[PDB]
Each structure stands twice: as C-alpha cells, then as structure tokens.
Design a protein around this ligand. Structure first.
Ligand SMILES: O=C(O)c1ccccc1-n1cc(C(=O)O)c(=O)c2cc(Nc3c(F)cc(F)cc3Cl)c(Cl)cc21
Ligand SMILES: O=C(O)c1ccccc1-n1cc(C(=O)O)c(=O)c2cc(Nc3c(F)cc(F)cc3Cl)c(Cl)cc21
Ligand SMILES: *C(=O)c1c(COP(=O)(O)O)cnc(C)c1O
Ligand SMILES: *C(=O)c1c(COP(=O)(O)O)cnc(C)c1O
Ligand SMILES: CC(=O)N[C@@H]1O[C@H](CO)[C@@H](O)[C@H](O)[C@H]1O
Ligand SMILES: CC(=O)N[C@@H]1O[C@H](CO)[C@@H](O)[C@H](O)[C@H]1O
Lengths: 794, 794
C-alpha cells in the first residue's frame, strides 16, 4: 500500500531526521526512505532468526575478509517486492527516486571479484532459504575512491560511514574479546596463552533479504574497539592502535602484502567469528561438541581466514580440553576451503617470526598440525625425501614461512576452485601431491552472479523485455533463459533488444559527458574493459589495439571505420607501480586520440574513474563488447565476464577461467575466442619467451611500440613509458605481444559483425539465452548439496 | 497518555531495536524508552527553531569547552511532564524504569563546576524561553571513570558513545572546515591565511527542553573529521591525527597545562562556532553587520574560548572586508566574559611561539589589539611605564606568553565573576588597572543551579512535599520557597521533612551496602564532602577531623558519640600527585576505621568512587551535613554548596565563595560558619604562616599527625604519607592546621544540634526556605537583563 509507505516516510522524516519539507536535504529524504524500507523487513528478519533457532537446520558460515556489497536501498526494495510501491510513494510526495538513490554510499568492503562473489553468495543463500551468515570486518574505510589527476591515479579515503549507515544494527550484547601477542606457558594443567593484549570485537548486523520469499539473513561484520581498561592523554589517544585493526581494507587484488596489521585483521575476524559460532552452537538445541560439524559448516573464502583452522583447535583443545585426535576430526569436518588465487605473488606465506610474535600459540598448533601430517606422509612413502618438503606447511629456504594454502588443505574436508579449468589446475598440478592422497577432496564450483543485482536492478529495460516474452520465472531459475531461443526468428524481438541496449547507452552517455569533456558518438560500439588493473588482465594489450586502431585511421583518413567508444576502467593497488603506469599510458593515449580532428567521431577513449559496484551497474548494461583478455591460465574464473553476457554484450576473450564455460554454453562460435590456449603458454614457456621477435615480425605492433618508447604519447616527457617497454620486452610473464596478432584479427571480425545489426543481435540473443548456468543460485545449490550438506527451503 | 507510550515503546523495541521480549536486553529497553521520549519533543524542537527564524529575537550563544550534562532521559521526562506516565507505562510492561535509567552513560563532557554551570544554564535558558544555544566539543571520551584499586585512584577511558547516543542528531548540512598552521600574506586584496591544514567540524545537536513550556533549544557540539582530499595504509591511519582534536576532555580542574592539542581544541570549537553563528546571521532577516551585536551575544565561559575574539575579528576583517575600527566595535559589543578562576597556576597563558606556529594570523591580530590598547594607556598615563607592562596582553619575561584574561577583558563589553565576594576581588585587585579605566564593564552574577535536575529530579520526595504545601510555582520561581517560612512551628511538617530525608538515606544506604562492603548505621548523620579533589578544597582538613573522631572514640569507648557516616568523593587530575596521595590517605583511614571493632557503628568512612553528575543526584538528597571548607579566598563561588542547601542539608564551611551569600539569605546562625576569613588570611600571610606552632599547640592535632607520619594508617609502608607531611609543614598554601581548631569546634556544635531533631529540622527548613536565590533561573535573568539584553519569553 502506497499510502502507508508515504505515511511511514513522513513519520521518519519528522521523528528520525527531525526535519520538515522546507529544510529537508536530499540526504534526509534518502535516510527517511531507507528507514522506511528497513522497517518492512524487520518482521521477516526476526522470524527468520526465530525459525533457525526453532528448527535447527545445519548453519552455513561464509568467512571472508571482503564483502563488496555496493548499495542496499534499491536491492532491498526489489527483493522485498516493494520497488513499484516505493517508487510510487516517492513520486506522489513530489520527489525524484533516482536522486534519493544516488545519495547512498557504496559499501565498498572488497577489492574486486573475490569480494563481489561473497556478496552474490549472500543474496543467493538468502533467496534459496539457507541458514547462512556472512562474517567479515566492518572496515571504517573500504576500497579507496580513485580520482585521475594529470592522467595519473590518485587515492582518496573512502569515508563511507561519515554520515551514518541506516542498514546496520550494532549488537552490543555479542561483543567478544580477542587476544594478541603474549607468550605460551606450558604447565601442569596444560598449555596456557598468557600476558596477551586484548581488543574488543563489536559486531554489526546488516539484513540480507531473499528474493520474494520470507527470508532475511544476516551479514555480521566486526568492529575493533579498545578494552575498557586500560601520560593520561597519550594513553587515551593510543586506544587508536586497537581500533586501527578494522580501520581500512587492504587494497591489493591478487597480491600478497605480508604486513602485521593485515595479519591482525585476519586473526581478529577469525577469533571473533569462531567464538560467536560456538556461542550460538551452545545456546542451541544441540563430546558436547560431537554434533558441531552437523550443525556448522564454515567456508574459508581463500586463505585469508586460514587461521580459523588453528583457532578452532585452540578452542577445542586449550579451552574445551578435548583430545587432539577428536578435535582434529571435528575441525576437518567443519571447514571447507575455496581456492581463488592461481598466481605466485598472490599466495599467502607468513613469516614464522611474525606469527610467533603475534600469535605464538597458533604457531605451536601449526607446527603440531604439520608434524602429524608429515608423520603420516613418511609412513606412506618411506623414502620419498622430497615429498616431505613439497607437502610441509612450513617453507624452509631462508626466511621460513607458513604456507597458508597447505594449512587450509589439511584442515578441510573439501577444497574447490572456481571454474572447470581452474579447479583442474589446482587439483592435478598445484596440489597434485595432495589430491593423489585423497582425490574425492578436490572439487569444482564454477562461479556465478546474482541475477537480482545484475539483471533486475541494473537493467530493468532488459529484465522486462524478457518478462514480456517468457514470464518472470527466470528470476528464481535462470536456466529458463533458454526459452528466448524461440525468438531466433523474430526480427521484431531483435529490434526490441537493440532498443533496450540503445537506451542504456543513451542513459550512460548522459552520465559520461557531464563528467568527461569528450563527445560520445551514440552510434559507436561501446567497447569495455572494467576490472582491477593488473598485468595478467592485460589492459595493456587492449591499449596496444587502441593505438593500432589510431594508427590505421591516420594513414587512411578516408577508409571505412566502424566507430568505437573504448572504455577502460579499474583501480590499481596503491603500491602497484606497473598498474599505475598502465593507467598513465591509457589516459595519455586517450588525450591524443580524443583531440585529433583527423579521427574525430570515429573513435573515443575514456578512462572510467572510480570503477566500483554501483558504477558497474551503470556501465555493464550499456556495453556492446566485453573485453576478457587475461592470459590463458591466469584468471581463475572471472565474474565480470558473466555480468556482460547476461546484459546483452558480446565477448572477446581467451580460453581462460569461466570464458571456457561460457563458450561451452553459448557455442564457441557465438563468442570471439582468440589467442594461446593454456598448452601454448606451456609450450612458449618451455621454449622461452622472446618478446623482441613479435616486434620485428609484425609491422603494426612495431609502430605502436615505437610511438610509446619515443614520446608520441608523452611529448613533454619522451622517456615516460620506459619501464613499460622495458617489461614488455624483457620481463612480461603475460606474453602480451604473443597474443597481439590473434587479438587484432579477432577485433576485425568483431568490427565487421557489428555493421550487421541482425547478425550481431542474433549472437547477443544466443549469449543471453545461454547465461542461465551463471546464476549464483546454481553455484550455491552445488555447494549446498556437495560441500555443506544443507538443503534449500522456504 | 499511558496506553500510547506503551504502544510507542513496543514499536521502537520492534522497528528500532529489531527485538521482541524474549531476547531484548536491558539496554534494548533503555533505547526503546529513550526514543519514545525523544519523539515527544521533536515537534517543539522543529517549531522553536522555526520560531527563532521567523521572529529573530536576539540570540544567546554560550560558548564553553565543557558541558557536564549527566543523563538525559529522566531530565527530559520531567521537563516534558511525562515521568509519571512513563513510570506507569514501563511498570505495566513488567519492567523497572530505574534499571533502564541506569543503562544511560553520563555525558561527562566537563570536569566540575564550570562544566556543570554551563549545563544548568542551558536548562534555565530553555525554561525562560530565551533563544539560546550551547556550543562545545563532542569529546569522544569525557572525564575518565575513576576506579579505586588497592586504595588508589586509577583512570579508565570514559567511552560513553560506544553503544550509540539516542539523544544526538548529526547535522551534515552544517559541517565546516577549520584551518591550522600555514602562513600569512598581506596582499593588495586583503590579508590571506594560506597553506593551512584543514580539519572538518561536524556538528551534532542534542535537545535542551524547557521545563513545562514550548521551547526545546539546542546544544551543538562539534566533532573533528579528516578532510577527504587527503604509504597508502599509513596515510589512512594518520587521519587519526586530525580526529584527535575532539578525542578526549582535558581533565584538569583549575590548572593550566599548556598542551598544543588543547590549544587546537580551543581554536577548533571557536572557529566552527563563529562560522556557524555568522552563517545563521547572514541567512536571517538581517554590512548589514551593523545589526550583528543586536542579534548575537556570545558568552565566553572562562578564557578557554578567548580565541573567539581575534577569530571574530579575522572574519570581519579578512573575509567580510570590514575596516578594523568597525569590526572591533562590533566585537566588543558581541562578546562578554565570565571569569571563574582564582589560582595563579590556573590562568591561561599561552606561549607566543606555539600561537605563532598554530595560528599565525590570530597572533598578528592579537598584537594589533594590544597595540591599539597600549596607546590608549600611554595617552591617559603618560609617565606610567610599569602600568603598561601590567595591562599588556603580552607577558614579556623569558618565555613570552599571551595573557588570555587580558584579551577577554579588552574584547568584551562585560566581565563578571560568579559570586559577590569573588567579583569584588576580580574588579578591585586582580584587574583594578582595567576597572579603574572602565568601572561599568565589571559585574557580578552570582552562580545558580537548576531546581529541575537538582530538586524535582534528584529528590521527588522533597519536591512533592513542598508542592503539597505551596503549590508548584516554585519550580519556575524558586524565590517562592520563602513561603516555607510560615511552617516553622508546624510539628507535623517538620516531621514530614525528616521522613523525606530518612527515605533518601535508606535508598542511599542500600546503594552503599551493595557497592562497598560496609554496614551503614541508618541513624548516623551523613556527613558529605563531594567535589573534585584539590588542596585548596581541603579534603585533607576533613580527613584530620575523621582521625580526630576516631581517636576520641578509642580513648573513651563509653562516652556518648553522635554516630556519623562520613562520605568523601571526587576525582583527582591524573598528574596531580598531592591530590592522588590525599585519596590514598582517605581510603587508608577508612580501612582502619571501618574495621576497628571498638568503633563499630559509631563511625563509617566511604571514599565514594567515580563521583559524577548522576551519582551527585543520589548522594545529595541523602546528605545531613555538607562540607564546604575551602580556604577563604580560593573558591570563586561553589555550586555543590547550593545543591545541599536546596536538598535539606545543613552546611559547615568557611566565609568563602557563595557560602557568604548562603549565610546572608538564611542567616549566619543557620549555617555552621568557622575559620579564617579573607582578612585573617591576608594577616597570616604577612606575618608568615608557621605550621609548626599548631602541631605543638593542639594535642589532638599532634596525635593525628604523628599517626599519619609513623605509619599508623599504613603499616606495610610507614613512610607512605611523607609527601603530605612535608607539604603540611613547609608548603601549605591553604593553611590546613590554622583552621583545624575552629573547624573541630565547629564539628562539635553540629554533633550537638544533630541530637536535637526538632532544632535540626527547624534550621534545615530555614535553609530550604532561603535557597530561592540560587536558582540558575535567577542567575540567567540577571545575565539576560544586564549583559545580553534579551527578554524571557514563555
Ligand atoms: O538471541 C538469541 O540467542 C535468540 C534466541 C531465540 C531465537 C533467536 C535468537 N537470535 C539469535 C541471534 C544470533 O545467534 O546471532 C540473533 O542475532 C538474533 C537477532 C534478533 N533480532 C535482531 C536484532 F536484535 C538486531 C538485528 F540487527 C537483527 C536482528 Cl534479526 C532476534 Cl529477535 C533473535 C536472535
Ligand atoms: O535549517 C535552516 O536553514 C532553517 C531555515 C528556516 C527555519 C529554521 C531553520 N533551521 C536552522 C537551524 C540552524 O540555524 O542551525 C537548525 O538547526 C534547524 C534544525 C531543524 N530541525 C532539526 C533537525 F533537522 C535536526 C535536529 F537535530 C534538530 C532540529 Cl530542531 C529545523 Cl526544522 C530547522 C532549522
Ligand atoms: C564483478 O565481478 C566486479 C569485479 C570483478 O570483475 P572481473 O572478474 O575481474 O572481470 C570487480 N569490480 C567490480 C565493481 C565488480 O562488480
Ligand atoms: C555540583 O555542582 C558538581 C560539582 C561542583 O561542586 P563544587 O561547587 O566544587 O562543590 C562537581 N562535580 C559534579 C558532578 C557536580 O554535580
Ligand atoms: C584472489 C582473488 O581476488 N581471486 C578472484 O576470485 C574471483 C572469484 O573467485 C575470481 O573470479 C577471480 O578470477 C579471482 O581473480
Ligand atoms: C575554573 C573553575 O573550574 N572554576 C570554578 O567555576 C565554578 C563555576 O563558576 C565555581 O563555582 C568554582 O568555585 C570555580 O572553581
């Protein structure tokens, strides 16, 4: 009822914001509607927790250093079935719903795909009706806001909580202490962890509404506070050091920075979370611990929470006094581990000395785990000397580091990767030693995305067209998109789909031009690469094509060119030198291409600043061509690739990650595949990569490189890109030049299909009808039936 | 309405706390009641801000580094008339309102009297309907929580906002930048203060409801926030540096510590406050600035906000482009200054170096003020060199210092002390060079306390009793308590009054038995000294009388002794060593006394821990004898003295501060006055105070002293009180031994009168009936009429 939403909105503006219509700001109006929406899920939120208590289904705990949630307001209105009615209430009050919605800050508590997978997973688990909780840290500052100054990336603190967060509720009654430093005592009564510093963990709960059912799950994020208690003023100011633990998200994507503060974040979330889970188990209706793993499944989102394993043992053994053997069995039955990482600089390998200083009892537990584990490998392969050190959790040359991924393997009953190709590599290659010993342990769960945020919310244009032709059933069961196959005839439908795309591109062009000076050709193909800046992901390669395209327009100003707007966006980690140069390069190239009247409206280049969830929601539905061009074997899965496939873009990319599986589903000819498969990378490695050759052998490449190296793109600073040229020529692990030729030929095929609207849109249709498999709902049912041993319900 | 308050409470329990009665905590209930109650003042809060805008009465700004508010819930129910309905609603829900009340953290954002005076003032200004605002700093941590471990004060961080504060509203639209450091350029377009560091000031509003009227005024308290255009992680942590400005209250009662962080707090609150005042003035119905002092009054609460004077000049000159002489005239008419300070070490004298670095432009402006000021003095007194040096704002010795009082004197049109005798000495001695020049500048405004918090709230028994006899008009005109005079021969009324005191003692005794393990004689005289711990206040002297009573009992366990519970309480500044030693002495004496089996229920001693506003509210209504015993000439006014008078305590004290006026009103013979007066103290200083002569001349003292010094009260460390002894004999500025005799005799008289209930209560009744003068309503009327030129409305 619209009328009761208006009344609610007005009660909140008056009692909650203390405002009337003459002095209310847009923010006041935003908070008023958010409270009004939140009030509508309270009944289900309470009932849902009551239900789990009454029925005791086995509970799933998603443990993660990252939750890339984006904005809550719209997502909540849609999942509650309240968007139409709220829209209508706000309209009648004389307000602009878009404007209210833009005021909300992103909860940008993740870096990219790992964080965003956790968020799709919550949406899905709640939609499927599972008893799931996400546990993470309530960062005061999420991933930084990126601005571009003088074409370089500059970082601003992302102060997302400054004005308050109507979507969280503090849970003071569930505050817990966490322990750090101190020392081990071995005594008559057992092994004691003593003289520790204490930091308080205060949880805050955000609701996670299922799509059109009665379920609201909880995301509980922990915030660090100084104990209570304890130059007096200085001592009050130093309470800051304890709160520094949950201050800011580490902004590395696929890279391991072994800093102490980060190790503290990791212990912090793991110690608070395990205590809470044990408190809930004990208050439940369930050798008191025998039933623990039938009531509890904890999923380790990469190695970041790996410490959960020895922490659970610490609790079981030091506090609850269970025998080691019994505790170890319960531990293994409780945890499952998701590998996402692939790349050697991305692997967590903590210095034994750092751990000893910070968590000396956990070191002992880790050594002790490693002993049993190794004892059992000796017994099975009595004089395989080297198997012992390949399989040891400790890595011994020089420093001494704990290999956290081995810790997670021995402590879990399931290890999975995130796409067929990735899981296969993890299994037969990277942890070959481990899966021979127990093959049934390793599995695959191909990633997915939620079709709530990533179709209904971001693309109401397309959602409705689909609903006109096939019903609204697809929202709960995405495989029904295959029905859009029966419109392969329909030129009418094919014009309707191009029409949706068109509007999205117009909408997004309004945005683009208010922010970038640049003039957008509305009839150009929107060509888009948006994802974190990393060498493996090869924004560079895209950039080499952009220049290749420019060099072609110049030499033949008259020849036919299919116009492009080339969009490339993403954040670079602040300490990642090469990624920052790559950004400088793209913006330098943009400057040249954009102001050249020779090229004019044929081709425009935009660096998209501050790429983040709520921006992806704008740019994805406006995309014609999705760039997914990581070197074969580097992208564990990808999820951007799936977002685009579902939103009517075509894909150019390598046989890597979930691109393989998208090709399987749409038909390989309905995507633009190109480049080395993973065997060719293997072959090229073995024979040695000589970058110089492809540069000699290929006229179009050479020009591009000569321009970059010489100052074409930086006249005022002709040696600007020296470190790039340098890396491409002598140190490129990702073989950019090696894929240059197949990539440029592939793009030419793309450009000529686009000139044919009916054939372009025919392929787009086969992509959308094939995207069903990529719903996170499919992903979550798989984890449920094969890892967690739980059942979807309502 | 009862039924409706229950519905409201239940709605907030459900929609604001997300709870039901099964898992709600006491804190959930407190929060649900707080919000139900806040909702009742929201309409008048909006309306009274609208009213001020529409009618533009002259606005009063009370600018203070301290607001010692205590709890908000009960005070608010009372001033709104809802207390009984809420007691009834909460009771019918099966809860106990007093337990919900205990959940609330004091807003301890003050040290003592200066801070409590600001709070009582806000209550009075609301009740009188003046268009008044309080402006302060929203300290993240107030005055520390005092623990006593093993006889010693230990400090714990007062983390009052940990769980949230339902009484404040953040006001994003009024966020303001504040500037520090940088440098000055005198250009041809005016003076420019540039390369500054910026800290944002985000204001939070708390409501200040008048008693039973239509006014809710505002307390606006600023919070420090780092700006968002600024190793990445370290730079994000370093944002803590900016936010440290409002982290914690400096806890010195009556002592200047020249810390840089404190100077920053001072400028912080003054810069934000002045900007906010100027924006309001400019958005209102009124250069242009000629109407400023007719629309704005700013009261400076001590010299802490002295910077306001050059800052207002900076805005008028550098930013509004007014000429110096016009800006200076408006300034003098805008500010007035309250001086509360007596002791030399408490005078604010900032180093010029420090002010140059932090505030280079305020230094120039202050030098200019001094220059124009010293010229008028060369002119009136042509050959008076030393007078120039006396009246200078710059103290010129080794370290050059700014004398903030002199700055407040020349930038203000009125300067007041806070009691007759204090204002006198401020005028004729301390600032006689200034008052000779400007006699009408210097005024008296005798301090006052609000009878809402300090009678209706803390003592419902007495408040009801009085209302039953003379109606309820006294609450808004406390002079009406003189009507209680006509009940002096009324035996039943005298008995009723004692019964009220009796109840207060029982309720308070339960509190003492449950906190301290000490059996309380319910019929003992409650003899109470509660105030910040300071030598001038002479808690020491009290402690000498306690040991004296103990000895008289030891020497003579058969002699009749009028039984006492002696309560001493108060916090010591953290680096005030002597203060700390005095606490340890008191608790040491108590250990001996409370456990001596020869004493038993004759004499109990309690060190009352964590003395604060909401504990004042418990102990004052239960007091028989109030100790106000500072050395004559050291207490500017006192306000505790006033709280006991209104609540049915007799007073023993010196002719000091407001004790003098208490005696005028009540009749000297109705107080227990003793000891040297201000002239006696002069004479003994001139003679030279030799403490040796009293120790030898008075055998009862000599024993007390010997015992302290020989380890009688500290067996495991005979030497413990060495520092106290040394001070007493060679460095006692406050002449403890010299008032001992007179004070002990005076105690003996109190014991006599105590044995005669009918005589005791007759004297009580004359005190209560004379306490009308000490309403902060009276005080605020005088400031309104003689300083601010504004009128009480309704
Ligand atoms: O508390 C219990 O032990 C309990 C007992 C019986 C049935 C349910 C219970 N329960 C357990 C929780 C947990 O284990 O973490 C809850 O968080 C919980 C929360 C709520 N309410 C609520 C809340 F107070 C704030 C918020 F942000 C979101 C919610 Cl859902 C309620 Cl009525 C019961 C809860
Ligand atoms: O804001 C204006 O510009 C204004 C315009 C016309 C009339 C009154 C105005 N007004 C001025 C304020 C100021 O100058 O500081 C206010 O704080 C203010 C506050 C409120 N409401 C309110 C609020 F939003 C939160 C809160 F904590 C407590 C209150 Cl009283 C309102 Cl309706 C008007 C206000
Ligand atoms: C979506 O998944 C997404 C990503 C991940 O993209 P890639 O899989 O790396 O291509 C990163 N950042 C945001 C904001 C996303 O929505
Ligand atoms: C009472 O006003 C009060 C004071 C001031 O008491 P004195 O006038 O110094 O005796 C200090 N602290 C608290 C909590 C008070 O309520
Ligand atoms: C360490 C990390 O960020 N891993 C990322 O995980 C997401 C989700 O699994 C994968 O799509 C992506 O390939 C992989 O790069
Ligand atoms: C600096 C300071 O705290 N001054 C105090 O101010 C209060 C309120 O005016 C007086 O009652 C008191 O005697 C005096 O000590």
């Amino acid at each position: 009822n619209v009328a009761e939403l208006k009344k609610s909105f007005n009660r909140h503006l008056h009692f909650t914001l203390v405002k009337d219509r003459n002095v209310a700001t847009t923010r006041d109006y935003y908070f008023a509607l958010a409270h009004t929406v939140r009030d509508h899920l309270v009944g289900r939120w309470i009932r849902t927790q009551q239900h789990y208590y009454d029925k005791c289904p086995k509970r799933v705990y998603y443990l993660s250093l990252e939750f890339y949630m984006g904005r809550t307001l719209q997502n909540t209105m849609i999942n509650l079935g309240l968007q139409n009615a709220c829209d209508e209430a706000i309209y009648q009050l004389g307000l602009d719903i878009e404007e209210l919605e833009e005021i909300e800050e992103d909860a940008g508590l993740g870096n990219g795909g790992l964080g965003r997978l956790a968020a799709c997973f919550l949406d899905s688990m709640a939609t499927l009706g599972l008893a799931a909780y996400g546990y993470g840290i309530r960062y005061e500052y999420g991933i930084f806001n990126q601005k571009i100054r003088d074409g370089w990336q500059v970082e601003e603190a992302d102060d997302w909580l400054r004005y308050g967060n109507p979507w969280e509720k503090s849970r003071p009654e569930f505050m817990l202490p966490v322990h750090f430093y101190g020392k081990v005592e071995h005594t008559n009564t057992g092994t004691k962890w003593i003289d520790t510093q204490v930091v308080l963990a205060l949880p805050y709960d955000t609701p996670v509404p299922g799509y059109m059912n009665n379920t609201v799950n909880t995301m509980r994020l922990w915030s660090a506070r100084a104990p209570n208690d304890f130059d007096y003023i200085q001592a009050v100011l130093d309470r800051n050091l304890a709160e520094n633990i949950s201050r800011v998200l580490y902004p590395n994507d696929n890279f391991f920075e072994g800093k102490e503060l980060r190790l503290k974040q990791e212990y912090f979330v793991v110690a608070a979370t395990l205590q809470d889970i044990i408190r809930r188990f004990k208050a439940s209706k369930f050798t008191v611990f025998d039933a623990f793993p039938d009531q509890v499944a904890i999923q380790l989102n990469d190695t970041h929470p790996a410490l959960a394993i020895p922490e659970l043992m610490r609790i079981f053994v030091d506090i609850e006094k269970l025998p080691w053997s019994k505790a170890w069995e319960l531990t293994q039955k409780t945890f499952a581990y998701t590998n996402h990482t692939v790349l050697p600089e991305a692997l967590e390998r903590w210095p034994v000395d750092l751990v000893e200083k910070l968590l000396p009892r956990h070191l002992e537990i880790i050594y002790e785990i490693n002993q049993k584990h190794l004892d059992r490998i000796v017994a099975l392969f009595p004089k395989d000397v080297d198997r012992l050190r390949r399989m040891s959790l400790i890595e011994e040359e020089g420093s001494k580091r704990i290999n956290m991924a081995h810790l997670c393997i021995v402590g879990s009953h399931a290890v999975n990767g995130v796409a067929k190709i990735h899981s296969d590599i993890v299994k037969t290659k990277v942890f070959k030693d481990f899966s021979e010993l127990e093959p049934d342990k390793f599995q695959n769960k191909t990633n997915g995305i939620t079709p709530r945020r990533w179709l209904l919310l971001c693309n109401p244009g397309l959602a409705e067209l689909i609903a006109e032709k096939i019903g609204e059933d697809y929202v709960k069961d995405l495989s029904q998109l295959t029905k859009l196959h029966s419109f392969l005839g329909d030129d009418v439908f094919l014009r309707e789909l191009a029409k949706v795309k068109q509007e999205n591109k117009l909408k997004f062009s309004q945005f683009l031009e208010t922010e970038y000076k640049v003039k957008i050709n509305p009839s150009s193909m929107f060509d888009v690469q948006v994802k974190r800046i990393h060498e493996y992901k090869r924004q560079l390669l895209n950039c080499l094509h952009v220049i290749t395209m420019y060099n072609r327009i110049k030499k033949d100003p008259k020849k036919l060119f299919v116009p492009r707007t080339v969009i490339i966006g993403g954040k670079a980690a602040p300490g990642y030198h090469m990624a920052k140069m790559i950004i400088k390069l793209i913006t330098s190239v943009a400057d040249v291409v954009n102001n050249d009247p020779m090229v004019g409206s044929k081709l425009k280049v935009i660096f998209l600043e501050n790429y983040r969830v709520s921006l992806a929601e704008k740019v994805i539905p406006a995309t014609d061509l999705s760039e997914q061009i990581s070197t074969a074997g580097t992208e564990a899965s990808g999820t951007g690739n799936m977002k685009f496939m579902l939103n009517g873009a075509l894909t150019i990319g390598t046989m890597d990650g979930a691109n393989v599986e998208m090709a399987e589903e749409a038909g390989e000819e309905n995507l633009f595949i190109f480049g080395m498969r993973i065997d060719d990378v293997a072959a090229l490695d073995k024979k040695g990569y000589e970058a110089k050759e492809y540069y000699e052998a290929l006229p179009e490449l050479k020009l591009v490189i000569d321009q970059i190296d010489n100052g074409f793109f930086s006249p005022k600073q002709p040696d600007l890109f020296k470190d790039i040229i340098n890396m491409l020529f002598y140190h490129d692990r990702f073989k950019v030049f090696a894929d240059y030729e197949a990539y440029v030929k592939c793009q030419d095929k793309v450009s000529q299909l686009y000139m044919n609207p009916k054939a372009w849109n025919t392929m787009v249709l086969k992509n959308i009808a094939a995207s069903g498999k990529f719903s996170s709902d499919r992903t979550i049912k798989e984890y449920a039936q094969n890892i967690w041993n739980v059942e979807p319900s309502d």
